[PDB]
Amino acid sequence: MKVPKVIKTYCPKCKTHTEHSVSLYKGGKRRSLAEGQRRYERKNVGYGSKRKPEQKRFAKTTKKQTLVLKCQKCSYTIVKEGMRLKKLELVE
RNA sequence: CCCGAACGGAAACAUCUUAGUAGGGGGAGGAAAAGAAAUCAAUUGAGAUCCCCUGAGUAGGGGCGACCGAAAGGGGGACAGC
RNA sequence: GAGGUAGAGUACCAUCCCCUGGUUUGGGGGUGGGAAGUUAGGGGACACGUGCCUCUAAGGCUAAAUAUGUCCCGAGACCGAU
RNA sequence: CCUUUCGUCUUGAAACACGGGCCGGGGAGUUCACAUCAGUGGCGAGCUUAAGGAGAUUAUCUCCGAAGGCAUAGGGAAACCAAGUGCCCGCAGCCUAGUUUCUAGGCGAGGGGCAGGGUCUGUCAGGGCCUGAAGCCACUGAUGUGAGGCUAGAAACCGGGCG
RNA sequence: ACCUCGGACUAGGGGCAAAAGACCAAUCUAGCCCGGUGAUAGCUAGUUCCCCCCGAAAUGCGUCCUAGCGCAGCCUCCCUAAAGGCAGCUCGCGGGGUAGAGUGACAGAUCGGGGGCUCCAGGCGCCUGGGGCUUCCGGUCUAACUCCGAACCCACGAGCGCCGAAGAAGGGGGGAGUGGGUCACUCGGCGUAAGGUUGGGUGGCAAAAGGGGAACAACCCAGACCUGGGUUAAGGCCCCA
RNA sequence: UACGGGGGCUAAAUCCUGGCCACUGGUGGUUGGUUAAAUCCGGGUUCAACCGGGCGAAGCCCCACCGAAGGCCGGGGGUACCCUCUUAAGGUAGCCAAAUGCCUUGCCGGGUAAGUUCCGGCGCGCAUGAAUGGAUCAACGCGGUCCCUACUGUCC
RNA sequence: CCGCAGCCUGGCGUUGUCCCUCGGGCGUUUAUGCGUAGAGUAGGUGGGAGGGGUCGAACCUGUCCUUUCGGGGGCAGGGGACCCGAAAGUGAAACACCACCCAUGGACGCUCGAGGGACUAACCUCUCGAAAGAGAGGAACAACGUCAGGUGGGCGGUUCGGCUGGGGCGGCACUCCCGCGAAAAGAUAACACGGGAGCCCAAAGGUCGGCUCAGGCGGUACAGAACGCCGCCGUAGAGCGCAAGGGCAAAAGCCGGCCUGACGUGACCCUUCCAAGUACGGGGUCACGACGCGAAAGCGGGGCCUAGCGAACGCUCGUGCCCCCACACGUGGGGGCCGGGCAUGACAGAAAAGUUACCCCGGGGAUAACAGGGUCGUCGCGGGCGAGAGCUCACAUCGACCCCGCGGUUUGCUACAUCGAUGUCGGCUCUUCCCACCCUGGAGGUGCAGCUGCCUCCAAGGGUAGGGCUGCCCGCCCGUUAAAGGGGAG
RNA sequence: UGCCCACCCGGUCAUAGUGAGCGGGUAACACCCGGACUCGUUUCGAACCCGGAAGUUAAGCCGCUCACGUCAGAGGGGCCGUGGGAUCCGAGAGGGCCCGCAGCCUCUCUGAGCUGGGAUGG
RNA sequence: GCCCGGAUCCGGGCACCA
């Protein structure tokens, strides 16, 4: 599905409708020193079995496509709810 | 004082718990061990160790699941120091 | 008033393992590195800096308050020959 | 004249379903801890002592010991902030009149409905929790949970020894 | 590679095996003794005195769940509260697409005739046969058809009827059991059927004696506090009786 | 102390032991890719934790060899012969209705008055075949089976 | 599914002395440079038209090194002194000099490594020695300790889903949507029937305007049933992303214009889930803030309506602040509240393969095999009808296509009884019964001359044997016989 | 006056509809005449929009007749269901009786526009 | 998510606890 690069929606910081630049969401690096990564490493020291459950059965084939909209006057960003699609063709 | 499980529970089970238990080896005494702050807590206070009632299933640990778990302080018993 | 003394493979650091409520913070052990030493060291829940507060590790000894019951005395809404 | 063999699982079973020769004796919901309800008792914006100390006719008894706990303020992750009053119905009961006989009329504690007040969140209406002054202790019983846990019953797994 | 005796060595996740999982003190797909240990059991068996009052469920959803549990429904006990409640009927006002009935009202199926048009084949422009379209007339059907449409069932208001200040709408609290059902009548789905299997409604049994059906959980009569007298129901009246 | 110690498979002798290295496994090699801790460099942090980069062993990816290593030994089209695909090749010598053949009491012969068993031959071999050992019986058997003679209370 | 030994390899330690080489760096040292247009080697940024010139130049003649032998770079003498342009070309010019960069090689002092070689005194092996000690060989490797990667059923712990006309194999009736089952309110089951979803669309979404669809008829060149034009009819016979059902005509369809309401925050209600508890998901109605389209009322938090989706913990992003300790303040770093994404299809969410005929325990008649019960499709037998054949003639005899029944001797279907046991094939031995009659007895018909046949009715008193083959039962076969019937009794 | 007849805005949404033929207007409703201007045709003043007024009852509109459509009433014909009951019938499928309720189709005949709010005509 | 090679995709070896 095709989506424009620029969309005019409500900027809640500016309190009016402004232009936004559209991009797809992408996550960051896992960042060792996160509290749940410090705890996992503390659990893997010593002897034992595999410590934690790991997923093996997979059913879905797509992923929810999320749109990221940045207000072009104040850089305020609104993140929208995702929707299961193949690959959002963001070309204008 | 060292070495050190499984059954069982988690309605399965492996981290976990059971449990530093059961058991094994070494060393005493009429009691042992600990014991005179490189301690606690907080506007500059207390004052060696041990035991009882509490603080308290609190802080906190945990497939943050089942479950596990203090200390300071308060009240007492005895209350030495070299 | 001036000068002298104060415990080393020890404290601590990285890593591995076991304990622990100890969690980026606690304890012990194995392996490697390894101080300062009074113009010094340690501590005050991640790490460091500056004040402030507090203590002196790495050498021993130490009654009383308590744990037990082979044994001796006494007691009892204990049993009464399956 | 009327009447199939007891207990049991089970739709029924129930008997060609299982346990059952006779008699005597033994033989299975118990204890503790916490929590919550109930029946009663004591004190009441408070209640209650624990460990313990002193005395004594010495495991009883008497005096002392509120440390702590529960309740009295709640909301919020936290920094932080912090109530308890005014309207309407109206049961019992009381008063007035008739007691003809009584929602006829007033007043109405407890109870119900609308609001108000504290706090978090939202940009207002909103949404969550709280606030209209009763609890603590004791004895007994019931149930839940934890310990063997109504009584009996596995195949197994582990530690140390003996052949 | 013969048979046999005395001594000795190998020990339990270990030994020894000319190999069968054989043998290791009547024990071996992992010996025995004592301890952990009264291991755990959603499973099986047993669970001890009398009277009185009330009185179920075998259903829905979730669950490594269907031999078990949680949340609801149904039983019992207590406190409160203070005037209405609804298991039944009638009237009024509304909802519905089932039995039936239709097919020229949609969608599918389905049997014959008459007229008109066309092509092909045969016979001597005509006749006969087959095919396609149109038109008119009659006939057969539908769980997944409807231009229609009952009996019947249901919502609300009023009235009647019954319960209620003695036995009490709404609120609060304590304790459960139950989650294997089964048959008869009746309306169905699957099946050649079945004392089959799976649904809706009513009733027994379960948890219900007694009277009838020869005897009979379930069918018909009927709900047993005890003792005596009477009248009936179902059923019966030749003998058993 | 290799005419040895250790480890496999087959099973005396006689006649023999075919084709295939694609897969798995073993052994060896390497232009090259990836590759942990430690160390080194840059950033960051008054120090650390933390981010990057470089270097990076064995193994793996890649190549070759090995069938008395585990093993495997088909189909289609055309005229015994040639081409193609699975996945490398396409059952050689022999043997058979086998202690291995579903159909099945296969078909023909022998033996019996009469033979689903037995013997011989055949070979549409569901699903025979070569040390996973093929064919083969001299001697031996408290091994399995069929036939004859003798003998009999096994039977009438 | 995982662990742990053993093995292989690397770092650190025990671990030491002499070298040599190579690769990095640090402060230095230097000399080397042709996409094309052109006096010709523009590699680039600038000061810089002046720079060199007894403050010794352009020029002939050779030794020599090199290169895409293009051509430039350095040699002293013969020359006692000359050339580039400010002028001609280049998306970028001056061999006018000087600087840095890209880029070649070598050398100084220092550091880091990496590799190779040698040595002996650690360490190891052997010999002699009662020991003390001595000798020989190897050697900083091996070996051992510790950490890291690989391999690793050698050994240990475990898991090996469910429903289900027994279990298994199959299927998915295991999450969701439409019709029917379903009995005109609501609720309602089947391994019942007919099918679908796990997405697609920046327009296929919002609004405003204009228009009318499938199909048919008349007239027109190519023109044809079906191109464009002019007229007539047309209740929908079209289209509306996708299953099925419902809805829709100055539209919800077709064609255009302008847009992004497929919007930020916060509530309530319906359905999933009847009355009567209940997570997600989906939908509906709004408040505040801001937009779009319309003259306007207004319509618009996606698609005409009913499917297209997912907990805790963990990670991550968005968004404004709150907190960090036995004291206070500061920096880095962590944690918190509110919303989005990463997924569990067994879809109200575990991280998971077989095998046992060597097997074991607790149970189950809630559930299979033998046997009993119910049913009779299958199996065996009877009746009706009469196509036909029998020279003619349906019924002496046979009897198609269909229709109505019986038995309980086959095989199925069901799961009522037995799972703390009712000994499960065949044969032998012995007893009895049924009749649907094979022989023996009676009667009749005939396509009955006699003999022999064929058929119908009564009748169960008596009989129904011996062998070969196979475990059989059935069956085939041999020689006879009056005939060598067929069934039941757990 | 009047009442009803058109017109504007409606309610009911076929008893109200569709086709054909005919009747009727000096006002009203229309066709009609024309385009400078507001506006306009992916060409066309056809349509929309603006400005007008000679002509006409031929269209539309209203009324009447006739054909079919539709809603009812009456009559002839085809088909037929159901709530409660019984030791009613029958081997069953089904059927009869008692108390309580109906329905659908097809022919033939007869009718068929009502109505609320406001400015022109009779 | 990486490296690397090959035409955003593909291949090889390693990273990856809802």
Short mmCIF file of C-alpha atoms (C1' of nucleotides) in Angstrom, two decimals, chain G residues 94-338:
data_model
loop_
_atom_site.label_atom_id
_atom_site.label_comp_id
_atom_site.label_asym_id
_atom_site.label_seq_id
_atom_site.Cartn_x
_atom_site.Cartn_y
_atom_site.Cartn_z
"C1'" A G 94 51.07 28.86 -15.69
"C1'" C G 95 57.74 24.14 -15.85
"C1'" A G 96 56.81 32.73 -12.49
"C1'" C G 97 59.31 30.79 -7.10
"C1'" C G 98 57.34 29.06 -2.52
"C1'" A G 99 53.96 25.83 0.97
"C1'" C G 100 50.36 21.50 2.33
"C1'" C G 101 47.62 17.28 0.35
"C1'" C G 102 46.90 12.17 -2.80
"C1'" A G 103 50.70 9.07 -3.55
"C1'" U G 104 56.78 5.64 -3.94
"C1'" G G 105 61.09 4.03 -1.40
"C1'" G G 106 64.86 4.29 2.03
"C1'" A G 107 67.38 5.96 6.81
"C1'" C G 108 67.90 8.07 12.34
"C1'" G G 109 66.16 7.66 18.04
"C1'" C G 110 61.75 5.29 20.79
"C1'" U G 111 57.46 2.04 21.45
"C1'" C G 112 54.39 -2.04 20.13
"C1'" G G 113 53.77 -6.33 18.35
"C1'" A G 114 54.41 -10.98 14.67
"C1'" G G 115 57.64 -14.71 12.81
"C1'" G G 116 62.18 -17.62 12.47
"C1'" G G 117 66.97 -19.52 14.70
"C1'" A G 118 70.28 -20.89 18.57
"C1'" C G 119 71.49 -21.98 23.85
"C1'" U G 120 70.92 -24.21 28.89
"C1'" A G 121 70.07 -23.39 34.01
"C1'" A G 122 63.84 -24.09 35.09
"C1'" C G 123 60.79 -28.41 33.78
"C1'" C G 124 60.53 -33.52 31.96
"C1'" U G 125 62.55 -38.82 30.80
"C1'" C G 126 66.17 -42.63 31.90
"C1'" U G 127 70.68 -44.66 34.44
"C1'" C G 128 74.00 -45.05 38.98
"C1'" G G 129 73.53 -44.09 43.99
"C1'" A G 130 70.78 -46.68 50.99
"C1'" A G 131 70.48 -41.38 50.88
"C1'" A G 132 73.27 -36.98 49.76
"C1'" G G 133 74.70 -36.44 44.94
"C1'" A G 134 76.49 -37.67 39.82
"C1'" G G 135 75.82 -38.83 34.36
"C1'" A G 136 72.96 -39.08 29.53
"C1'" G G 137 68.77 -37.31 26.34
"C1'" G G 138 64.97 -33.69 25.41
"C1'" A G 139 63.89 -28.45 26.43
"C1'" A G 140 61.40 -22.97 27.48
"C1'" C G 141 58.22 -26.76 24.02
"C1'" A G 142 55.87 -30.67 26.72
"C1'" A G 143 53.18 -31.20 31.40
"C1'" C G 144 50.12 -29.09 35.03
"C1'" G G 145 46.59 -24.99 36.93
"C1'" U G 146 42.99 -21.36 35.16
"C1'" C G 147 39.87 -18.96 31.51
"C1'" A G 148 37.75 -18.98 26.30
"C1'" G G 149 35.80 -21.18 21.64
"C1'" G G 150 34.60 -25.96 19.00
"C1'" U G 151 33.21 -31.05 19.15
"C1'" G G 152 30.65 -34.16 22.10
"C1'" G G 153 23.47 -39.72 23.45
"C1'" G G 154 30.23 -41.27 26.16
"C1'" C G 155 26.92 -40.19 30.62
"C1'" G G 156 22.53 -37.51 33.47
"C1'" G G 157 17.58 -35.00 33.85
"C1'" U G 158 13.33 -34.68 31.25
"C1'" U G 159 9.23 -33.94 27.45
"C1'" C G 160 6.84 -36.91 24.05
"C1'" G G 161 -0.85 -31.81 22.96
"C1'" G G 162 -6.29 -32.51 22.38
"C1'" C G 163 -10.98 -33.90 20.41
"C1'" U G 164 -12.52 -38.81 18.98
"C1'" G G 165 -19.54 -43.88 18.15
"C1'" G G 166 -12.54 -48.04 21.83
"C1'" G G 167 -7.42 -46.37 20.55
"C1'" G G 168 -4.60 -45.67 16.21
"C1'" C G 169 -4.21 -43.58 10.94
"C1'" G G 170 -7.07 -39.66 8.87
"C1'" G G 171 -9.74 -34.79 9.61
"C1'" C G 172 -9.98 -30.25 12.43
"C1'" A G 173 -16.45 -29.72 13.68
"C1'" C G 174 -9.12 -26.56 18.26
"C1'" U G 175 -9.58 -18.72 17.03
"C1'" C G 176 -13.00 -15.94 13.79
"C1'" C G 177 -17.39 -14.88 9.66
"C1'" C G 178 -22.17 -16.15 6.40
"C1'" G G 179 -26.50 -19.52 5.11
"C1'" C G 180 -29.19 -23.97 6.81
"C1'" G G 181 -29.98 -27.44 10.85
"C1'" A G 182 -33.57 -24.15 14.35
"C1'" A G 183 -39.66 -26.06 15.56
"C1'" A G 184 -42.65 -17.39 12.87
"C1'" A G 185 -39.68 -13.90 20.61
"C1'" G G 186 -34.94 -15.48 23.22
"C1'" A G 187 -31.47 -19.86 23.98
"C1'" U G 188 -30.16 -24.64 21.59
"C1'" A G 189 -26.19 -30.28 19.94
"C1'" A G 190 -24.00 -33.70 15.99
"C1'" C G 191 -16.39 -36.66 13.04
"C1'" A G 192 -24.22 -32.57 10.44
"C1'" C G 193 -24.72 -29.99 5.26
"C1'" G G 194 -22.96 -25.64 1.68
"C1'" G G 195 -18.67 -22.41 2.07
"C1'" G G 196 -15.01 -18.58 3.74
"C1'" A G 197 -10.88 -15.21 6.98
"C1'" G G 198 -5.39 -14.77 8.86
"C1'" C G 199 -5.80 -9.51 4.07
"C1'" C G 200 -6.10 -5.73 -0.03
"C1'" C G 201 -6.59 0.00 -0.97
"C1'" A G 202 -3.37 7.19 -0.56
"C1'" A G 203 -7.58 5.40 -2.74
"C1'" A G 204 -11.17 1.17 -3.23
"C1'" G G 205 -10.96 6.93 2.33
"C1'" G G 206 -13.89 12.58 3.30
"C1'" U G 207 -17.16 15.93 1.06
"C1'" C G 208 -19.75 18.59 -2.96
"C1'" G G 209 -21.84 18.57 -8.02
"C1'" G G 210 -23.59 16.17 -12.42
"C1'" C G 211 -25.42 11.62 -14.37
"C1'" U G 212 -28.05 6.43 -14.72
"C1'" C G 213 -27.13 0.72 -14.94
"C1'" A G 214 -27.59 -4.94 -17.47
"C1'" G G 215 -30.48 -6.07 -21.77
"C1'" G G 216 -33.39 -5.07 -26.22
"C1'" C G 217 -35.53 -2.16 -30.67
"C1'" G G 218 -35.46 1.64 -35.10
"C1'" G G 219 -31.69 4.91 -38.44
"C1'" U G 220 -26.41 5.46 -39.71
"C1'" A G 221 -19.18 3.80 -44.41
"C1'" C G 222 -15.57 1.01 -43.24
"C1'" A G 223 -19.67 -1.08 -38.64
"C1'" G G 224 -19.55 -7.09 -37.78
"C1'" A G 225 -24.15 -9.94 -32.00
"C1'" A G 226 -20.65 -6.58 -29.72
"C1'" C G 227 -16.40 0.88 -31.51
"C1'" G G 228 -18.83 6.33 -32.28
"C1'" C G 229 -23.56 9.29 -33.44
"C1'" C G 230 -29.46 10.27 -33.43
"C1'" G G 231 -33.98 8.35 -30.98
"C1'" C G 232 -37.58 4.50 -28.12
"C1'" C G 233 -38.14 1.06 -23.90
"C1'" G G 234 -36.01 -0.73 -19.59
"C1'" U G 235 -37.78 -1.67 -10.85
"C1'" A G 236 -32.42 -2.86 -11.18
"C1'" G G 237 -32.76 -8.40 -14.54
"C1'" A G 238 -26.05 -4.02 -13.26
"C1'" G G 239 -22.31 -2.33 -9.94
"C1'" C G 240 -20.79 -1.85 -5.00
"C1'" G G 241 -12.06 -5.32 -3.50
"C1'" C G 242 -12.76 -10.73 -1.61
"C1'" A G 243 -17.45 -16.16 1.07
"C1'" A G 244 -22.43 -16.11 2.01
"C1'" G G 245 -26.59 -13.31 3.40
"C1'" G G 246 -28.85 -8.35 3.81
"C1'" G G 247 -29.10 -3.21 1.89
"C1'" C G 248 -28.92 0.77 -2.10
"C1'" A G 249 -31.72 4.75 -8.14
"C1'" A G 250 -32.07 13.17 -8.66
"C1'" A G 251 -27.98 6.65 -4.86
"C1'" A G 252 -24.59 3.50 -1.28
"C1'" G G 253 -23.59 2.75 -8.32
"C1'" C G 254 -20.66 5.88 -12.75
"C1'" C G 255 -17.79 10.50 -13.89
"C1'" G G 256 -15.44 14.88 -12.00
"C1'" G G 257 -13.57 19.28 -8.30
"C1'" C G 258 -11.31 20.29 -3.75
"C1'" C G 259 -9.18 17.43 0.41
"C1'" U G 260 -6.81 13.89 4.58
"C1'" G G 261 -12.09 12.97 10.29
"C1'" A G 262 -7.50 6.49 8.38
"C1'" C G 263 -7.31 13.55 13.81
"C1'" G G 264 -4.97 14.71 19.82
"C1'" U G 265 -7.18 13.81 24.74
"C1'" G G 266 -11.31 11.64 27.88
"C1'" A G 267 -15.99 8.86 28.70
"C1'" C G 268 -20.38 5.69 28.21
"C1'" C G 269 -23.05 1.67 25.82
"C1'" C G 270 -23.92 -3.06 22.65
"C1'" U G 271 -21.79 -7.78 21.00
"C1'" U G 272 -18.45 -11.71 21.95
"C1'" C G 273 -21.00 -13.77 26.94
"C1'" C G 274 -29.99 -14.68 26.75
"C1'" A G 275 -32.22 -14.72 31.50
"C1'" A G 276 -27.11 -15.31 35.02
"C1'" G G 277 -20.36 -14.50 36.28
"C1'" U G 278 -16.61 -13.43 32.05
"C1'" A G 279 -10.20 -11.49 28.93
"C1'" C G 280 -9.04 -9.84 24.09
"C1'" G G 281 -11.31 -8.25 19.33
"C1'" G G 282 -15.15 -5.50 16.72
"C1'" G G 283 -18.93 -1.72 16.58
"C1'" G G 284 -22.06 2.40 18.18
"C1'" U G 285 -23.12 7.55 20.74
"C1'" C G 286 -20.59 11.74 22.45
"C1'" A G 287 -17.55 16.16 25.18
"C1'" C G 288 -13.25 19.49 24.58
"C1'" G G 289 -9.29 21.20 20.69
"C1'" A G 290 -8.40 21.64 15.58
"C1'" C G 291 -9.52 20.80 10.42
"C1'" G G 292 -11.75 19.38 5.22
"C1'" C G 293 -15.77 19.88 1.82
"C1'" G G 294 -20.17 22.64 0.93
"C1'" A G 295 -24.47 28.83 -0.44
"C1'" A G 296 -26.16 26.31 3.83
"C1'" A G 297 -28.63 22.97 7.31
"C1'" G G 298 -24.78 19.55 7.87
"C1'" C G 299 -21.47 15.29 6.90
"C1'" G G 300 -16.86 13.20 8.19
"C1'" G G 301 -12.27 9.70 14.56
"C1'" G G 302 -11.55 4.72 7.34
"C1'" G G 303 -13.71 1.05 3.60
"C1'" C G 304 -22.55 0.09 2.37
"C1'" C G 305 -23.38 -3.85 6.93
"C1'" U G 306 -21.91 -8.76 9.21
"C1'" A G 307 -14.72 -11.85 9.13
"C1'" G G 308 -9.24 -10.03 8.54
"C1'" C G 309 -6.83 -11.00 15.22
"C1'" G G 310 -3.38 -11.91 20.90
"C1'" A G 311 -2.09 -11.77 28.39
"C1'" A G 312 2.11 -11.14 32.55
"C1'" C G 313 7.35 -10.49 32.58
"C1'" G G 314 11.33 -8.67 29.25
"C1'" C G 315 13.15 -5.29 25.27
"C1'" U G 316 12.32 -0.92 22.48
"C1'" C G 317 10.21 3.85 20.76
"C1'" G G 318 6.98 8.31 21.71
"C1'" U G 319 5.74 11.95 25.51
"C1'" G G 320 6.22 15.73 30.31
"C1'" C G 321 7.79 15.41 34.65
"C1'" C G 322 9.11 12.17 39.52
"C1'" C G 323 13.31 9.25 42.24
"C1'" C G 324 18.71 7.09 43.44
"C1'" C G 325 19.87 5.40 50.30
"C1'" A G 326 23.41 4.69 57.13
"C1'" C G 327 24.82 13.13 55.37
"C1'" A G 328 24.75 17.18 51.60
"C1'" C G 329 25.82 19.07 46.65
"C1'" G G 330 27.50 18.04 41.19
"C1'" U G 331 28.45 14.91 36.50
"C1'" G G 332 27.82 10.24 33.91
"C1'" G G 333 24.49 6.18 34.29
"C1'" G G 334 20.10 3.55 36.03
"C1'" G G 335 14.78 3.25 37.66
"C1'" G G 336 9.41 5.20 37.53
"C1'" C G 337 4.15 6.97 35.69
"C1'" C G 338 1.10 7.33 30.57
#
